Every structure is written in structure tokens, then in C-alpha cells.
Coordinates of C-alpha atoms and ligand atoms in Angstrom, one line a residue:
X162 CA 9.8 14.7 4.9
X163 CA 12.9 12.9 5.2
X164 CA 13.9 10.4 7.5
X165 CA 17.0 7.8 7.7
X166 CA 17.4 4.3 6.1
X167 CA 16.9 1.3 7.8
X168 CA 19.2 0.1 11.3
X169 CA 20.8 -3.3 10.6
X170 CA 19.0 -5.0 13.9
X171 CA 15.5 -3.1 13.0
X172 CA 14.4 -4.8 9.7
X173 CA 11.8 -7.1 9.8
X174 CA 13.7 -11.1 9.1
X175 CA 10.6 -13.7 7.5
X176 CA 12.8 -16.7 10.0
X177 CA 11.2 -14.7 13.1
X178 CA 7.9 -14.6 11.7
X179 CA 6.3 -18.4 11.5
X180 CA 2.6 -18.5 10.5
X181 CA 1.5 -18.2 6.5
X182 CA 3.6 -15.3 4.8
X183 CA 0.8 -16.5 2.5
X184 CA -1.3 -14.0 5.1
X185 CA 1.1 -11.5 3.9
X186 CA 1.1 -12.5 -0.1
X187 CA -2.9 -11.9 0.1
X188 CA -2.2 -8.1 0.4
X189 CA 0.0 -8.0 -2.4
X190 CA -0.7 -10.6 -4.9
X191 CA -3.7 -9.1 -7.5
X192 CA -5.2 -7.6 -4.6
X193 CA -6.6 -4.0 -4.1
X194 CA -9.6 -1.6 -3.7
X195 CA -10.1 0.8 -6.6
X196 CA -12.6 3.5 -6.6
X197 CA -13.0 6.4 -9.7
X198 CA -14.9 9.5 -8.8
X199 CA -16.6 8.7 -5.1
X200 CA -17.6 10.7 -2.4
X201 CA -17.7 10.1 1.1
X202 CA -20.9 8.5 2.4
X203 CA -20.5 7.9 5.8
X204 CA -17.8 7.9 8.3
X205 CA -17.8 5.6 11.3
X206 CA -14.4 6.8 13.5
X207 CA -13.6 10.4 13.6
X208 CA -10.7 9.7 11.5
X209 CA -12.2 7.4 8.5
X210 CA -14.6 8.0 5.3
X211 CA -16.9 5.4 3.8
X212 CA -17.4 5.0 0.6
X213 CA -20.6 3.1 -1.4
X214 CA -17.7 1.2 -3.4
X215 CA -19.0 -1.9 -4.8
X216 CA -17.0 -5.0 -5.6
X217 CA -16.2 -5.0 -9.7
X218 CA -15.1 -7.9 -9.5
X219 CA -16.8 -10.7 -7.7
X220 CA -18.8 -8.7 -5.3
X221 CA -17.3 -9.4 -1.7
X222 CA -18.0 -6.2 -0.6
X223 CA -20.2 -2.9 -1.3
X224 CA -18.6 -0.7 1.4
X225 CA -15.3 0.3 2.1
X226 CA -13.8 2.1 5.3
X227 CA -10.4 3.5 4.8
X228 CA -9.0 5.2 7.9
X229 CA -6.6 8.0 7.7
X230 CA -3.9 9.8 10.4
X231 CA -6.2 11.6 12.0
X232 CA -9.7 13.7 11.9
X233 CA -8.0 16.6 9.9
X234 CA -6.9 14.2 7.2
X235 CA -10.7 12.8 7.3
X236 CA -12.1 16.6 7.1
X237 CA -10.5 17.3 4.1
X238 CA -11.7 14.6 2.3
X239 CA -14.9 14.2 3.1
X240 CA -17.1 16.4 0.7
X241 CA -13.9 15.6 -2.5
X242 CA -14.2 13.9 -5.5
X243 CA -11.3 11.1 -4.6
X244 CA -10.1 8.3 -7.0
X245 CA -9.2 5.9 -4.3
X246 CA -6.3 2.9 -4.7
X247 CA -5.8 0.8 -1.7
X248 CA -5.5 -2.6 -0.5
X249 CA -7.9 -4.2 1.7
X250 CA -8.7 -6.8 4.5
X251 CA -11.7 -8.1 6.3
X252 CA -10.6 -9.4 9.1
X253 CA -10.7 -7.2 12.1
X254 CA -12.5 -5.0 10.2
X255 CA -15.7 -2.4 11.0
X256 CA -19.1 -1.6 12.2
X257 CA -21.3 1.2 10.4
X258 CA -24.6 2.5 11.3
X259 CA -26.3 -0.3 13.5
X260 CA -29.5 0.2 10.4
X261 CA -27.9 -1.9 7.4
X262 CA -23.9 -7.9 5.8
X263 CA -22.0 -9.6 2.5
X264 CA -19.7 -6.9 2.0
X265 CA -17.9 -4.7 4.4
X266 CA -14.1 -3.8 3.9
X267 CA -11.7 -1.8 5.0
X268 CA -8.5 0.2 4.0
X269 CA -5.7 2.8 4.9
X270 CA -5.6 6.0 3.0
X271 CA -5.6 5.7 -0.8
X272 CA -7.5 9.0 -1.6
X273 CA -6.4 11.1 -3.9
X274 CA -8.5 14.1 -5.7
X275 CA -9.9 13.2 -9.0
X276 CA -9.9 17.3 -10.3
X277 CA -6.2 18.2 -12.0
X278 CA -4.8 14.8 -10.9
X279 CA -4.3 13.1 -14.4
X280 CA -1.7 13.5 -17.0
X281 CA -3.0 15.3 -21.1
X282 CA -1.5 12.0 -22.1
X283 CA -2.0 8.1 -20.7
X284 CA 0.0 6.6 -17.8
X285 CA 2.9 9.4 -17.5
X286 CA 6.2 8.8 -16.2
X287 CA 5.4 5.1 -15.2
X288 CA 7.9 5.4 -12.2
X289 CA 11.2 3.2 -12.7
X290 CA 11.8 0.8 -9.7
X291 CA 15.4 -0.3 -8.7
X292 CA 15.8 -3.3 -7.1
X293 CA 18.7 -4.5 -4.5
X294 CA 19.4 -8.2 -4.1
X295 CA 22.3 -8.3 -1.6
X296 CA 23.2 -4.9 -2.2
X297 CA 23.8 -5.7 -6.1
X298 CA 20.8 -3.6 -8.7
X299 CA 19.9 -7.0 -10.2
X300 CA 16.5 -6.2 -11.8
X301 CA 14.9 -3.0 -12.5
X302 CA 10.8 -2.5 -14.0
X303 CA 8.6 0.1 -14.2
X304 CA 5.2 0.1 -12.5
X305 CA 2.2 2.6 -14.2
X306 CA -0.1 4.8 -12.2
X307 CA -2.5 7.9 -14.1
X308 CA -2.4 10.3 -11.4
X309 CA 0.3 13.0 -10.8
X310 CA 0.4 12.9 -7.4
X311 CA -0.1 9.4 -6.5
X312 CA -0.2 7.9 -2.9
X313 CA 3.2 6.0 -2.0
X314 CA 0.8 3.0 -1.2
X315 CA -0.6 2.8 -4.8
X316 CA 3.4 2.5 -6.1
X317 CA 4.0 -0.2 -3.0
X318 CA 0.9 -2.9 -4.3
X319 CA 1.9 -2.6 -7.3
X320 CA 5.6 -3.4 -6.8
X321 CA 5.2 -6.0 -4.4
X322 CA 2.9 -7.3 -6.4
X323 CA 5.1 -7.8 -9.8
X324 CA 8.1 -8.9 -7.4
X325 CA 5.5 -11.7 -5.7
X326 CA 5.3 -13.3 -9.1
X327 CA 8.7 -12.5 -10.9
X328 CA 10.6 -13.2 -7.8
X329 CA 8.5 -15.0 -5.6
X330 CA 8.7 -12.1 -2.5
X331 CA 6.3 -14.1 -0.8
X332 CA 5.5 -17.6 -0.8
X333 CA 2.7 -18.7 1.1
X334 CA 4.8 -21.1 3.8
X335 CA 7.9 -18.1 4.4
X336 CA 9.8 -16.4 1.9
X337 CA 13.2 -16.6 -0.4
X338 CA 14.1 -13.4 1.1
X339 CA 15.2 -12.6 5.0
X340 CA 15.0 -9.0 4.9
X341 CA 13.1 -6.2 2.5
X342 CA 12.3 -2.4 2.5
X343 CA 10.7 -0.4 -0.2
X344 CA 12.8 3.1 -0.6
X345 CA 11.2 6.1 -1.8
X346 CA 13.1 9.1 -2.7
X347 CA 11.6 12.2 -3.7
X348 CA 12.4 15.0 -6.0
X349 CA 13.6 17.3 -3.1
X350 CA 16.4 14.7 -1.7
X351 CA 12.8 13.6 1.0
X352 CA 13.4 10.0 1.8
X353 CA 11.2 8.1 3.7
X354 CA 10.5 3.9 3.9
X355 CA 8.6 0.8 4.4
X356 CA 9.7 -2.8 6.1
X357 CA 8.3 -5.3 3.9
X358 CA 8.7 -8.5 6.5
X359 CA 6.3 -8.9 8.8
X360 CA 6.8 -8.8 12.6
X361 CA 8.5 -11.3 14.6
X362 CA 6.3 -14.3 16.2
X363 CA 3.5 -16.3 14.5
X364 CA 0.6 -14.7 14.0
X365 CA 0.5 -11.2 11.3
X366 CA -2.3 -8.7 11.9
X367 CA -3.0 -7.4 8.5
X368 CA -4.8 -4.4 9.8
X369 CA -1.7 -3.3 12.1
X370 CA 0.3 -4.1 9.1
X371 CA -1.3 -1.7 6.3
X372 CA -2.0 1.0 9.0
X373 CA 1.5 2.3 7.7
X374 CA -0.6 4.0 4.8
X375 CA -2.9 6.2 6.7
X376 CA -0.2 9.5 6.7
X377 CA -1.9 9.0 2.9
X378 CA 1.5 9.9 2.0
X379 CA 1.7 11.2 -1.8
X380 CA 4.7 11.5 -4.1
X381 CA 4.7 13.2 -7.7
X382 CA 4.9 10.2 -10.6
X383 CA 7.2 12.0 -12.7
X384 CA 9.9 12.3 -10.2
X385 CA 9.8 9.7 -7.6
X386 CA 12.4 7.2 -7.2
X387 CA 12.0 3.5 -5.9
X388 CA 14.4 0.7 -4.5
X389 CA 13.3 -2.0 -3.2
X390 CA 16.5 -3.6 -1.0
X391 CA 16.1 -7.6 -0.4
X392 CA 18.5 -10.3 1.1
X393 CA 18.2 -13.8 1.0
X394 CA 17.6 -16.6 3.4
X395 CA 21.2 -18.5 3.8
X396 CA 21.4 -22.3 3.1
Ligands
ZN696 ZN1 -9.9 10.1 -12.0

């Protein structure tokens, strides 16, 4: 559980990252994997699952890797009903069985059990997110999930992804903000966070970048907390 808030000079700064924080947006901006009640299909590393999910949307892909921690994590699930919620790339992503093309994705963690996972009544406790803009609690919004224990990743897309159009997070040249980390804070006093910037230099590897989520970390939705601390670019 718990570990420290960010060191001044260890936050990611979007002026030391120069090529397309648009690469960055795509992972946030109406952008994820969702899956219902599916079972693992294949596996192609020792520590990943594949799952026959199909593209409900405008089919770019019918097969999704998600890679987890470590084969232990991967034993566990494999053989579970899992409702999965994830966000995905293409680019450096996988090769299956060598024996069957236009739609092959992949993912980090985003598995959660589909038996005693949802709430008697609708979206329950839609978690409450605090937001810091120059230390000031400026805005504040609630994001919804259906699952008790939902994975910290689920409550990240769906954050960045309402600050990416209420406060332009990302913009697809840099972005209005220097610095940014996502806070979780658990019932127990369990901290733990996320950078939100990108690495320093031009080029961002999307896979290195989600591979944060494959601890497939989970929180309980009635009790987490979330800040999300942001500082502007000067002028
Ligand atoms: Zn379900």
C-alpha cells in the first residue's frame, strides 16, 4: 500500500517532452477497451491473457492482450469471469498463435471479477474527484463506475478523460499544464500515484507508458478518494 507524494524535480514537465502530446490525448480522450463477462482464451507471454473481445464500436480489433505484473497475477485470472476496462494501443503491440490480421490490441490489467462485483442499485458511490490547479481545489466532478472494487485505471481514463475536454489536459501540439499527477487515497490512509506528463525527449512510447496499470491495482468505489494536482505553463 502506501507510498509518498511526488519529489518537486521527479514530475514529469510537458516543456521536456516535444513530439504530439496528441500521442498522449489518444489514450485518454473517448478511448478504452471494455469487456462484460469474458474468459481468457489464450495467453501469449507467461504474464498476459487474451480475450476474443471484439470491437463494438467500429471493429478495429477482435483480440485483446492485456498484460499483468507477473504470471501469478495471469494464473488467477485465467479460468474467471472478468468484466475488463482498459485503454488500449496498437502500436508495439503482439503476436498470438503463428495459425490466425485487422484487429489485434493490447492493454495493461483491467480485469476485475464479474461475480459479487456490482452494487443492488446502479452506479454506486460515483467517486468524487478533487482537483488542484496551482495548489488551489478549483474544480471538483464525479466520475461513475458499477463495480465495487474497481481498478485504479478504470477511475484514471475516465478522469483524464473529462479534464481533456473541460480543461483541455492535453492538446494535441503540448499542453496548458507543466506538471500533473492523479492521487489516490484509500479508505485505510493507502496512498499511492500516477505522473500524468509524459517523459522527457520527443518521442512517447504508449506501451511503456500504460504499463503503470499492470499491478491491476483495485480500490473500493465507495471509499476512494481522487486529486488530480496540475500547474500551468508560465507565459
Ligand atoms: Zn459485470
Amino acid at each position: 500500500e502506501s507510498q509518498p507524494d511526488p519529489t518537486p524535480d521527479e514530475l514529469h514537465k510537458s516543456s521536456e517532452f516535444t513530439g504530439t502530446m496528441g500521442n498522449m490525448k489518444y489514450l485518454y480522450d473517448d478511448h478504452y477497451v471494455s469487456a462484460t463477462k469474458v474468459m481468457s482464451v489464450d495467453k501469449f507471454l507467461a504474464h498476459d491473457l487474451i480475450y476474443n473481445i471484439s470491437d463494438k464500436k467500429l471493429k478495429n480489433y477482435d483480440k485483446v492482450k492485456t498484460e499483468l505484473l507477473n504470471e501469478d497475477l495471469a494464473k488467477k485470472y485465467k479460468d474467471e469471469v472478468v468484466d475488463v476496462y482498459g485503454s488500449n494501443y496498437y502500436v508495439n503491440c503482439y503476436f498470438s498463435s503463428k495459425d490466425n490480421t485487422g484487429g489485434k490490441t493490447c492493454m495493461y490489467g483491467g480485469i476485475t471479477k464479474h461475480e459479487g462485483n456490482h452494487f443492488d442499485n446502479g452506479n454506486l458511490q460515483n467517486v468524487l474527484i478533487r482537483v488542484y490547479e496551482n495548489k488551489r481545489n478549483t474544480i471538483s466532478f464525479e466520475v461513475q463506475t458499477d463495480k465495487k472494487s474497481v481498478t485504479a485505471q478504470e477511475l484514471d481514463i475516465k478522469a483524464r478523460n473529462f479534464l481533456i475536454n473541460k480543461k483541455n489536459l492535453y492538446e494535441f501540439n503540448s499542453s496548458p499544464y507543466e506538471t500533473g499527477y492523479i492521487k489516490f487515497i484509500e479508505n485505510n490512509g493507502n496512498t499511492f500515484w500516477y505522473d500524468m506528463m509524459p517523459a522527457p525527449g520527443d518521442k512517447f512510447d504508449q506501451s511503456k507508458y500504460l504499463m503503470m496499470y499492470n499491478d491491476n491495482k483495485t480500490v473500493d468505489s465507495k471509499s476512494v478518494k481522487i486529486e488530480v494536482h496540475l500547474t500551468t505553463k508560465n507565459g
